[PDB]
Design a protein around this ligand. Structure first.
Ligand SMILES: O=[N+]([O-])c1ccc(O)cc1[N+](=O)[O-]
Ligand SMILES: O=[N+]([O-])c1ccc(O)cc1[N+](=O)[O-]
Ligand SMILES: [Mg+2]
Ligand SMILES: [Mg+2]
Ligand SMILES: [Mg+2]
Ligand SMILES: [Mg+2]
Lengths: 127, 127
């Protein structure tokens, strides 16, 4: 495919959340461009490339029990970008906890994620 | 003040929505740096400076009846930035309509909005 239309961005960004929710690390990594970046949380230096990105998702999702769900609709653009609000259910010290996040993505001219930026800080975590 | 902390960003971004909701155009414009930019919707060229920004808010809010409310929490950063999901209630051809938006902001070292980017496209509008 080419640069995703607004409707295609919606679909891709919702699919990303589905894949996080089901914990399919390999399928998530395949959504990214080979040389993509992830800034998590936004404010921290980017990681680069599918090896580093795979390591990020393995560290976050490797336990197999994380859940994630949109908390409202994707807001897409006409230039291959979008933003979405969601909540992640994780564990911490055996305590269930939830993290509220907004991801901002930009897709490349092949429909792959070029950049991901995850906005959140510590007060978005609730034990 | 200086560059807003994560907690200060939350407060500022929530205040912005309150001011949109109450329709205080002049107070909104005062939140912006003198040379700020607004990209609305994201994907379109920025407007620049408080004159152009005031004209934007007068055109959107000048009728006095718009409402706006957060639909989930602000996601702030530790570098003076944040993102938030909200819904705007407007009128169109005398029809009430709602627009789902995510704003991404960056604040300057004085606590004023340096950049605002409003993510939405036409399918985020509902008549
Ligand atoms: O904080 N995180 O781990 C995180 C942040 C944003 C995401 O889109 C996904 C994850 N995750 O896979 O867990
Ligand atoms: O579309 N709009 O008009 C819009 C978009 C984002 C905003 O933060 C505010 C407005 N408004 O004042 O109406
Ligand atoms: Mg699921
Ligand atoms: Mg490439
Ligand atoms: Mg109000
Ligand atoms: Mg300045």
């Amino acid at each position: 495919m080419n640069l995703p239309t607004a409707q295609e961005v919606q679909g891709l960004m919702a699919r990303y959340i589905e894949l996080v929710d089901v914990g399919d690390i390999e399928a998530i990594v395949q959504m990214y461009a080979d040389d993509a970046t992830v800034e998590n949380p936004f404010g921290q230096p980017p990681i680069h490339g599918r090896e580093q990105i795979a390591a990020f998702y393995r560290q976050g999702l490797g336990g197999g029990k994380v859940r994630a769900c949109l908390t409202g609709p994707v807001r897409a653009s006409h230039n291959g970008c979008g933003a979405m609000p969601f909540r992640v259910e994780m564990v911490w010290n055996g305590q269930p906890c939830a993290l509220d996040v907004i991801n901002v993505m930009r897709f490349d001219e092949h429909g792959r994620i070029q950049t991901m930026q995850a906005y959140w800080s510590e007060v978005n975590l609730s034990v």
